[PDB]
Design a protein around this ligand. Structure first.
Ligand SMILES: Nc1nc2c(ncn2[C@@H]2O[C@H](COP(=O)(O)CP(=O)(O)OP(=O)(O)O)[C@@H](O)[C@H]2O)c(=O)[nH]1
Ligand SMILES: Nc1nc2c(ncn2[C@@H]2O[C@H](COP(=O)(O)OP(=O)(O)OP(=O)(O)O)[C@@H](O)[C@H]2O)c(=O)[nH]1
Lengths: 427, 432, 53, 427, 439, 190
């Protein structure tokens, strides 16, 4: 019932998915060996959403790991959860894409797409009633940004009606860690706009800012950032696994978010993020959670939400709380930030309350915000691409794998349209 | 599954390979006899004999047999496969034609056969490592011929060359401008990334840093081995944001002919001063960009950077690297081209450098090897061009090449090719 | 040698957010300082009194 | 319903405030970790006066800790009950004012007062109806005195109608430990007269004399003095937190004790002060309790009340007792010493009886007095200031921060006007 | 959090710095190798070492000191001695030829050769630290290098840093003991610069400490090591309040605010009262009153002048170890009621008492005994003008014949500078005389 | 706390003697359990003792300039779950030792760098067992060992189980017993 297939592409997406499976297993009480060690019946009633029963109390996650470089699969196998996944679910190539979208999307990952689709189909037909696909990747890389887009296109061709969720890490100028990341970012966002139905835009710069300021972490490792993204992912699909006062699954979220087909990019966040010192001296309540969800600093995208009006928003609360408090908080936020919300939609913010909080957490609230502020990020990427394409900075490395020069112009053509569409409704 | 073939040509290349393989054996714990007491990182550089002995995947070729026989009588005589140490009878006498048309062809067949034998045994070939010297005769001509044939046979594989560029004023040969000019033409067609270094620059490094005023060719080499090990470490050691050779080429090479990066190793300080100095990530990143820290005798300040790769090692946090790069980009002295807004590529590895016993370098927790594709090397090629013009105005020593079976017009062809390359840098360095 | 062998790491693999998220940990305890130490003497003298009543 | 905000400035202010919060937590049964470990429901009720709520019966004080030296914050945190406070309340500069009133009042105090006021108003807006502010500081120092006067002025500008009580530790010639402390005291007296509603002048010489003759304290450190001052601070506010036959809050005390706007410099005292040897040799009933209240040797201002007619007095009792006995003792102490009280005021003593005595005492009676003996206490400082200003000693340090001798002359004139006003009703 | 930078100039400055840094290494538990053997001393209140010793990435601790000398003999002795690995190699600044007891040679000629490197190293140290409290400058007040180079560095640092504190510990020439025949010239030439570029010139005489060792420690024939160790003890006791917990802390800024009445009157007298041999330690009671009384006796002053003939302006007492403020108040009352100790009428209270909870540490093999209580009594007295009177008399006698003038004028100095320095010293002694007069 | 791994299949017995070579062999890549246990125990000890930074880390031990030996207590609970019950780290350092009468010393002595016991079973015969096992393995008596800043618990433990008093407060922030005949005196008082 409403099973979800999870696909991890690229190094960033693979690490994020590994941390996500750690978090999910902790929430559902699944031992790293795959056994069940939980103590609550609700941890097992909807275990079928993310896992497959192996009979002898073992629950194998429904995850497909893909990466052209076998190092990531080797690290995952040697990691704490090497035996958790199905050993034949690691579909890896021989050599990495070399940060080249052309390679992974046209030849090197093109050989692997057949096997990846075969394993995805094998996982899908085993489900009672598939709900959607979760695909984690990075826009800046080569193998992630190429294989993810190709696989998304193939899946959408094969499965036209099933929802598609992608948790894509977007490059930022302040964390510019690749010379040719704008090319891959544009070439991937084209396919994302074309095919997928819901993309969560994660940004490394915003995650570093959150870890440095809110949590006050001196040395934010990638484990912390992946844990933040994993908590967001778990919060998004908490209504599919735990009963609550007001349930909101993936399709309901998608319906409430998008007013138009191509405006399906979101900026997520987490409410109870508190420092080590202030953890004991802060009273966690529905207000504090709401004003932290809607706080500009808590957003996981480099673009400031205060620069553009919100289209739609939704906080998926977890834990026991009074729906009167939640409704009052939403009304108060709508009234205070009237300039930050669109006029043509009367009630913007959606709500959802889940009974079961995160393990070791009294209550939490996962925020999802569809705002026009993402136009700033898209403009930044478009400007970088234009700067690198006037003089054809690295175009030959991509034309050597079978592309034409016209494709890059077409890829940037939709960015101008995508920015315009978001800017169209901004006032 | 990720292994690289290394080839050493000429006395300079072979002597560099000595230090390179000493460093690799130290890093992987392989005893110089080839036996490792006591876990799969050695697959990149070494092959398994099935009896616990590990043999390097290297082909060593030199027309003169003196240096190879010296190795075969040396301590490391037990590492390399005994019959892949290919030697000739007489050297090329600092003559390109001697090492290309007359003497080199007699041994090129055996050299290519051994390279093919290594490649067939290979399963995850990533690229080729070639060590040679531009000034020398064999290290220029035979390297040209060998890498030409290698490009013909394995055009789908990366070719990385670590050449010894002649210094601006420090020289040991009278005809080295001719050989370097002749090699410049052939490095453009086949070599994918040429990390040339200057003897004078490493001499200045060993003088200012390390407080050593009599550096030999045994100290310069150790540094080149550290550089190449830092480049390759992303293939055999786990870390965050590892950089493969293909990733390296994609991020560093903007145009098919603009593929001549520099090389630098920043944490090079004396042992007595290493302890009392705080070697933070910001400090090493800042001192990478010093003009006197580059291993090529050129001023990077005059040129404009186009692509920079920072291969950090040891105790490194990505937030620190990002902060250091932001600090570097905020500095106007380090100028980048306007058409490359994100000219930084980072590789962070968890394996700290291994210090050679009795070496000049101290133990440090973190290290970074910065490879920058800048236009500063156009000055070095211009001075070499001027030297060639001065020698070729009177046709000083071309009669040896003519008598060895080489047309005189080939010198003019190579000269015009180097002039075209310098014009290419002058064109590209102009902002959009 | 043994130290020449490759060195693994844990600092990259530390996940401090998991500790921060676990609000159930509310120990709030600290070890007593040395009474003879200057901070211990200050705590005893300036921040401490003897029962009068 | 009558929450009180506490402000600690300077080292002496911080230490006295730490002792005060220790004693208050002892009275309310508050664990040093912030939890509640009391046994009587009376403590839990009316706890909002000094403690906010943080969920799971954890309470954090409504206290603001201020000092220009971070070492004081480190000492407070490392000391007992350090974990009680909230880190956001800890506001500090880079270096201490260095016993310079100008440094702590014009440049460093001005830089820090913005953050201090932000914290204070954030705490105040969380209160349902604040009774007022109480502040602890030392006039002798630079940081304490200067930034305390600045805070008093700013708070009076921000909250004109609320009660401002300051427990100043006035300097004395006998226990003088700072060379330039007369300058700071003279500068601060003007602000204290102008803006504070009621100040409880405290002297270290008086407290040492109490520790030596009333108690038998051997080597009395600063902790014992701070404990006595803390007992007085808790006593003067016991009606706001506990029931009683005749309750009297701070405003009632100010109304009873302050006949004229400037004559609000009080004289604290604690009645059940008996040595460890004379414990079983004396009862603690009302008669001797009041006798010790009005005893000249039981004063914390180091000026003999016999040298000046009492204007008004107020003994705030605690514990179970009889109103008849209290009234009889007050009438007797007024009649037997009619020469020590002003004749133009018919009733000179205000009676307040609480219900909960301090933990460990059958009954207690905190005595405060608006006696005219403060003439000598301020006249000693005036004489010291006159002697020092005769030759402009140490004045370059003050003028280096933007001061003028006109300010010093004005402060001296204001102090002289205050002492002349007291002498007007002296006799 | 709070850091200080120590500059040691000249042979005397460098040797006193050796003593001071030995004492600090003992105080903070740092080996001469530069490594702290305790890993648990890196947390809690034990972070006091960050005031004097900086921390590197290798686990060692590098002192925040600059050792500068025009001649390399003493610095080479350091580099060869026990503290080879402690000091930073580039902090041990050397020249090539000494100043030869010539103020001009150390000021202009040999000064300008390495003044740039000295300033660069000082700036590099200042940039690394974030809470720089001030500078502790150690130099000899009558030498060549420690006068000329000290004046040059002081004026440069005053220009380049301004409000930062500058505390100077100078070895003022003794009234009778004199190891240099031309030291009055250098002394007066540098007293003009140190007057307008320092904040607390804690002056010290060699003969006074010699007498102290003779009468207290029973050391009939001492040397420079004992004097340097005593000066290091005084400096450590002064700076104890910057790094150790204790009631009534005394920062440098409040120290100067309370002790310095007027901008030019900043020449105090420093003494370390609880000086006694180990043999006499048992018999002595070592009470707070006894120690405070030992502070004020003329035989414990470290400048050979009679304090009775002058009036104290401000006295700062920096106690250590087990000290109760009640005892200090009683001791101050006993001192005030004494008629012999005359205070000025314009300063009613002049006792800035500072207390610390760190007991004094004794170096192994030292003359000082282990004591539970210690204090430094730093008094700004008018009685110090007698030392300047003696120096003026010596300078006038030597300069009447214009002896040794050619040595100075051969390096750019002009006799106008001599006249200006003499006039400045006369003005300073006149200021002391006029302020000491009661109102 | 607790760790989800089979510590029985990685450690021979309940008490494990781990050196720098042992920890290098037990790399986190394939043997993450031991490294995670070391890091967790170090963090818990630092939190309990209130130190500003953690002093026991696997990374900080493998790269140390001198070899150090660490001890950890593990107990298998239910299959793939195990708990950690203590941590002991001891190493060999050249200490600039001193004694009464201002004696000087240079002899190398054993150091107890860290000593943490879980608060649940702090006094339940765990610390004594670990210390006795360490003494047996090193064949070194307490008379030639030095303690780094012993918290009151450490000296009360020594009083209750070894009757060792008169602990000297070394200038190196170390503590030793009254036995100083380990080596000769480089500098006698006189
Ligand atoms: N009764 C008490 N008096 C104290 C205490 N601490 C200090 N004092 C006295 O207070 C007077 C002023 O000293 P302070 O330390 O308050 C100077 P302040 O902190 O206000 O300024 P800065 O030193 O510039 O931070 C002085 O006479 C001290 O002896 C204490 O805990 N109790
Ligand atoms: N950095 C470095 N340069 C070296 C070394 N050995 C030789 N060279 C340089 O090699 C250059 C000349 O080339 P060689 O290698 O001597 O000659 P060759 O290339 O072997 O050619 P033949 O003369 O035909 O053998 C000179 O610039 C030398 O300084 C070495 O170990 N390190």
């Amino acid at each position: 019932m409403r099973e979800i297939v999870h696909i991890q592409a690229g190094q960033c997406g693979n690490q994020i998915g590994s941390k996500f499976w750690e978090v999910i297993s902790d929430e559902h009480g699944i031992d790293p060996s795959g056994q069940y060690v939980g103590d609550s019946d609700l941890q097992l009633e909807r275990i079928n959403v993310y896992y497959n029963e192996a009979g002898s109390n073992k629950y194998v996650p429904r995850a497909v790991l893909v990466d052209l470089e076998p190092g990531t699969m080797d690290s995952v196998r040697s990691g704490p959860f090497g035996q958790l996944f199905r050993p034949d679910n690691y579909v890896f190539g021989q050599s990495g894409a070399g940060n080249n979208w052309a390679k992974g999307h046209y030849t090197e990952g093109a050989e692997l797409v057949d096997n990846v689709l075969d394993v995805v189909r094998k996982e899908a037909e085993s489900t009672d009633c598939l709900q959607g696909f979760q695909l984690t990747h990075s826009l800046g890389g080569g193998t992630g940004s190429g294989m993810g887009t190709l696989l998304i296109s193939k899946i959408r061709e094969e499965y036209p009606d099933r929802i598609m969720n992608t948790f894509s890490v977007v490059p930022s100028p302040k964390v510019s860690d690749t010379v040719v990341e704008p090319y891959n970012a544009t070439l991937s966002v084209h396919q994302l706009v074309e095919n997928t139905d819901s993309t969560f835009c994660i940004d490394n710069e915003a995650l570093y800012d959150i870890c440095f300021r809110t949590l006050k972490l001196t040395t934010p490792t990638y484990g912390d950032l992946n844990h933040l993204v994993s908590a967001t992912m778990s919060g998004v699909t908490t209504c599919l696994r735990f009963p609550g006062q007001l349930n909101a699954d993936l399709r309901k979220l998608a319906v409430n978010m998008v007013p138009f087909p191509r405006l399906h990019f979101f900026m997520p966040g987490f409410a109870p993020l508190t420092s080590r010192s202030n953890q004991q001296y802060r009273a966690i309540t529905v207000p504090e959670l709401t004003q932290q969800c809607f706080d500009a600093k808590n957003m996981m995208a480099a673009c400031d939400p205060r620069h553009g009006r919100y289209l739609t928003a939704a906080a998926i609360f977890r834990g026991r709380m009074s729906m009167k408090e939640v409704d009052e908080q939403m009304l108060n936020i709508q009234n205070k930030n009237s300039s930050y919300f669109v006029d043509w939609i009367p009630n913007n913010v959606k709500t959802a309350v889940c009974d079961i909080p995160p393990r070791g957490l009294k209550m939490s609230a996962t925020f999802i915000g569809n705002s026009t502020a993402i136009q700033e990020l898209f403009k930044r990427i478009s400007e970088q691409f234009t700067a690198m394409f006037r003089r054809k900075a690295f175009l030959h490395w991509y034309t050597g794998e079978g592309m034409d020069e016209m494709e890059f112009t077409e890829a940037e053509s939709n960015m101008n349209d995508l920015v315009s569409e978001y800017q169209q409704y901004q006032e | 599954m990720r292994e690289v073939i290394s080839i050493h040509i000429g006395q300079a290349g072979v002597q560099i390979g000595n230090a390179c393989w000493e460093l690799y054996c130290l890093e992987h714990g392989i005893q110089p006899d080839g036996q490792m007491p006591s876990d799969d990182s050695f697959s990149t550089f070494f092959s398994e004999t099935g009896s616990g002995r590990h043999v390097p995947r290297a082909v060593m070729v030199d027309l003169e047999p003196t240096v190879i026989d010296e190795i075969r009588t040396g301590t490391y005589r037990s590492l390399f496969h005994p019959e892949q140490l290919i030697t000739g009878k007489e050297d090329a006498a600092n003559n390109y034609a001697r090492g290309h048309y007359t003497i080199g062809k007699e041994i090129i067949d055996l050299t290519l056969d051994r390279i093919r034998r290594l490649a067939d045994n290979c399963t995850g070939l990533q690229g080729f490592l070639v060590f040679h010297s531009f000034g020398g005769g064999t290290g220029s001509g035979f390297t040209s011929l060998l890498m030409e044939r290698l490009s013909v046979d394995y055009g789908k594989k990366a070719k990385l060359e670590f050449s010894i560029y002649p210094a601006p004023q420090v020289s040991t040969a009278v005809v080295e401008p001719y050989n370097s000019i002749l090699t410049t033409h052939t490095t453009l067609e086949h070599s994918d990334c040429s990390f040339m270094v200057d003897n004078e620059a490493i001499y200045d490094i060993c003088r200012r840093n390390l407080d050593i005023e009599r550096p030999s060719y045994t100290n310069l080499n150790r540094l080149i081995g550290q550089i190449v090990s830092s480049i390759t470490a992303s293939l055999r050691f786990d870390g965050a944001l590892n950089v493969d050779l293909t990733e390296f080429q994609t991020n560093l090479v903007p145009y098919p002919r603009i593929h001549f990066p520099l090389a630098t190793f920043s944490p090079v300080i004396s042992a007595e001063k290493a302890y009392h100095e705080q070697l933070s990530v910001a400090e090493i990143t800042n001192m990478c960009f010093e003009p006197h820290n580059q291993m090529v005798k050129c001023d990077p300040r005059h040129g404009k950077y186009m692509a920079v790769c920072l291969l950090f090692r040891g105790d490194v946090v990505p937030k620190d690297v990002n902060a250091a790069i932001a600090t570097i980009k905020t500095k106007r002295s380090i100028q980048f081209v306007d058409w490359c807004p994100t000219g930084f590529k980072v590789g962070i590895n968890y394996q700290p450098p291994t210090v050679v016993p009795g070496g000049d370098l101290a133990k440090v927790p973190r290290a970074v090897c910065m490879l920058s594709n800048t236009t500063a090397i156009a000055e070095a090629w211009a001075r070499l061009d001027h030297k060639f013009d001065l020698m070729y105005a009177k046709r000083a020593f071309v009669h040896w090449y003519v008598g060895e079976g080489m047309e005189e017009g080939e010198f003019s062809e190579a000269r015009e090719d180097l002039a075209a390359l310098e014009k290419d840098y002058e064109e590209v360095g102009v902002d959009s | 040698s043994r130290n020449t062998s490759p060195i693994g790491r844990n600092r990259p693999r530390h996940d401090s957010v998991a500790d921060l998220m676990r609000q159930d940990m509310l120990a709030g305890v600290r070890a007593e300082v040395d009474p003879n130490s200057p901070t211990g003497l200050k705590n005893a003298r300036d921040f401490g009194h003897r029962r009068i009543w």
